[PDB]
Ligand binder design. Structure first.
Ligand SMILES: OC[C@H]1O[C@H](O)[C@H](O)[C@@H](O)[C@@H]1O
Ligand SMILES: [Fe+3]
Ligand SMILES: [Fe+3]
Length: 689
């Protein structure tokens, strides 16, 4: 029954002491028990924690990074909240503070004395240094970054730097014999306030710190007027203009724990009791977010409002975000490597068969396009959020998720026509596609109104034509969230492998990966769903009108296909009627949005350009299409894009997910969330929070 104690890892005597006071008062409140382990630097706790020597540590965005690096695989459990009179935030602006009358501008720091909060930290290192890389005139990795900064600045105080091989980096540092340049509050110039003092005491000419830090140390407008901020546009603005004069906006610091068996639950209860009991002004016996004057930010940043729990799937990469991840990864890559990724486009292939085709695409495009792969479509979207991939073609249903996580639709899939190949198709208004409900002419017993208890074949969960649209209309008729009980058995790749929704699914050829939501599951997709019907594994199939047409009458000559006929299948109309597959325009469940490519709003324009070219070269009218590669063909497996795609068109102004999917559907998708939500959906709720 009993659950043990959270072992918090401290980095210096001052920190231990605070921790002890923390344990003391916690037990006195008769709440969750704490324990204080002592190592000598945040870097060390990271190691301690992963080896089960400890359990938790607060870390600045920068260290969360390394903490998440392979050998350690730690993850952010709770993010600190800060308020500098707005909405408390889980982000903060990194700034560069200087005294007035110093003259520099951000592009003239060469030879200046500088004070950093510590090696590896967001505001104090990762961000300023990435901003000044263009002036370091640095080779890249072979050559230690520490070596450049050292030649760049006349002297500095960068706690945690090799004061041995690079003394220039530790030189301004005040500290006793070996306390000098310490990676703890032993070095008086460590941290936001440390770096600030190093500035006010006249040891350095520029302090690289947090937005609040000036206001924290100088409570009077008169004294702050003695200082300014260096804006990235080579001008200087007052200290309360950080909102305009910032080098960057990073994610708050965070409590990290092990990825496996980290006791996230223990840690959260502890912190929830702590805010409640010692948060801002709650108590007087102990203040969690306050420290001694000699040393600031002990255990947590002084004056933080409290914490917010970080959902489960979120790891350090997603927590930090693409913006941050790129700039940090970019301090460990060559100039050529950076510029190279910035000009290519990384597509995210979902599943083995897609990466194959993508690889063909890459080779054939002299690598203007590279690939990235995941087992699922959610994973791809995450990759895109971490910044490891640049885009992918998504179904309306997932354009919703992508949209809720901030991605925007770039171009849309225009199916092969019909009015005139008139324009090209690039300016044709996307006209969407009809979602239908298919069954065999044979079972004539069967009517929409009789699906109850019958077998179902879905393209996959989360998708428009299948799931979203039929389940949307059924939930309306039964008011029941138990989606796994309407149809007797079903195959819907993506569901709980032990639920009836995965009953009819078949996996690859050697019957492995049953129900997985990607090509490897043979009964996956429009094509897969329809087949689940033809092979009589299911009684009704949810797909689009065209899917039948493309696999009957011998068009698809795969064994199970070959013999089928437009004639063998009819659709179930909402009014209990039944029409031939051809009368779909008068017998559909809904009008869906064509699929669409999505990317971060940043990459959109470049993405477009590269795609207009790539499809002009291998598109539906691609000169080298039959010849060397057709981007829109894949042997009816609908890899990367639909096989009937003519071209990727313009959005006609519908540039946001809401605008693109449209009112209705967006709302319908939300009513369905009432029943079930996705972990990705939640992770994004927090990040976009
Ligand atoms: O009426 C259906 C329409 O739905 C959405 O607006 C799609 O973006 C569009 O392509 C489609 O024509
Ligand atoms: Fe920081
Ligand atoms: Fe779809």
């Amino acid at each position: 029954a009993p659950r043990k104690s959270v072992r918090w890892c401290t980095i210096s005597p001052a920190e231990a002491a605070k921790c002890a006071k923390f344990q003391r008062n916690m037990k006195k409140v008769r709440g969750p028990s704490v324990s204080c382990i002592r190592k000598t630097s945040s870097f060390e706790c990271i190691q301690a924690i992963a080896a089960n020597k400890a359990d938790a540590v607060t870390l600045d965005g920068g260290l969360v990074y390394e903490a998440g690096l392979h050998p350690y695989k730690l993850r952010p459990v709770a993010a600190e909240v800060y308020q500098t009179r707005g909405k408390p935030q889980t982000r903060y602006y990194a700034v560069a503070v200087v005294k007035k009358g110093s003259g520099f501008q951000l592009n003239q720091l060469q030879g200046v004395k500088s004070c950093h909060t510590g090696l590896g930290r967001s505001a104090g290192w990762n961000i300023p240094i990435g901003t000044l890389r263009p002036y370091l005139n640095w080779t890249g990795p072979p050559e230690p970054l520490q070596k450049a900064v050292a030649n760049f600045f006349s002297a500095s105080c960068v706690p945690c730097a090799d004061g041995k091989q690079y003394p220039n980096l530790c030189r301004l540092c005040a500290g006793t014999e070996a306390d000098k340049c310490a990676c703890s509050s032993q070095e008086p110039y460590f941290g936001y306030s440390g770096a600030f003092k190093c500035l006010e005491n006249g040891a350095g000419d520029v302090a690289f710190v947090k937005d609040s830090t000036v206001f924290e140390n100088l409570p009077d407008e008169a004294e702050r007027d003695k200082y300014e901020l260096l804006c990235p546009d080579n001008t200087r603005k007052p200290v309360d203009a950080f909102k305009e004069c910032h080098l960057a906006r990073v994610p708050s610091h965070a409590v990290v724990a092990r990825s496996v068996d980290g006791r996230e639950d223990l840690i959260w209860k502890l912190l929830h009791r702590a805010q409640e009991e010692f948060g801002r002004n709650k108590s007087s016996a102990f203040q969690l977010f306050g420290s001694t004057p000699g040393e600031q930010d002990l255990l947590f940043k002084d004056s933080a409002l409290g914490f917010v729990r970080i959902p489960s799937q979120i790891d350090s990469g997603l927590y930090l975000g693409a913006n941050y991840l790129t700039a940090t990864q970019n301090l460990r890559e060559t100039a050529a490597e950076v510029a190279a990724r910035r000009e290519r486009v990384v597509w995210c292939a979902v599943g083995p068969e897609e990466e194959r085709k993508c690889k063909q695409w890459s080779d054939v495009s002299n690598r203007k396009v590279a690939c990235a792969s995941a087992s699922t479509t959610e994973e791809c979207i995450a990759l895109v959020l971490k910044g490891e991939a640049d885009a992918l073609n998504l179904d309306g249903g997932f354009i919703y998720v992508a949209g809720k996580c901030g991605l925007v639709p770039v171009l849309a899939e225009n199916q092969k026509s019909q009015n005139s190949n008139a324009p090209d198709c690039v300016h044709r208004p996307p006209e969407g596609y009809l979602a239908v409900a298919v069954v065999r002419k044979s079972d004539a017993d069967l009517t929409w109104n009789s699906l109850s208890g019958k077998k179902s074949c879905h393209t996959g969960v989360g998708r428009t034509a299948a799931w979203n649209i039929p389940m949307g209309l059924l939930f309306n008729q039964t008011g029941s969230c138990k989606f796994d009980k309407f149809f007797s058995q079903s195959c819907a790749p993506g569901a709980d492998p032990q639920s009836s929704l995965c009953a009819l699914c078949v996996g690859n050829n050697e019957n492995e990966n049953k129900c997985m939501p990607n090509s490897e599951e043979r009964y996956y997709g429009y094509t897969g769903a329809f087949r689940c019907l033809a092979e009589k594994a299911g009684d009704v199939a949810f797909v689009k009108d065209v899917t039948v047409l493309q696999n009957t009458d011998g068009k698809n000559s795969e064994p199970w296909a070959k013999d089928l006929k437009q004639e063998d299948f009819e659709l179930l109309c909402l009014d209990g009627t039944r029409k031939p597959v051809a009368e779909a325009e008068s017998c559909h469940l809904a009008r869906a949005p064509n699929h669409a490519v999505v990317s971060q709003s940043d990459r959109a324009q470049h993405l477009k350009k590269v795609l207009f070219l790539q499809q002009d070269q291998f598109g539906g009218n691609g000169p080298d299409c039959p010849g060397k590669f057709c981007l829109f063909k894949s042997e009816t497996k609908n890899l990367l894009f639909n096989d009937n795609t003519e071209c990727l068109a313009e959005l006609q102004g519908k540039t946001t997910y809401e605008q693109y999917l449209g009112s209705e559907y967006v709302t319908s998708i939300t009513n369905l969330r009432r029943c079930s939500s996705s972990p990705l959906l939640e992770a994004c709720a927090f990040l976009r929070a």
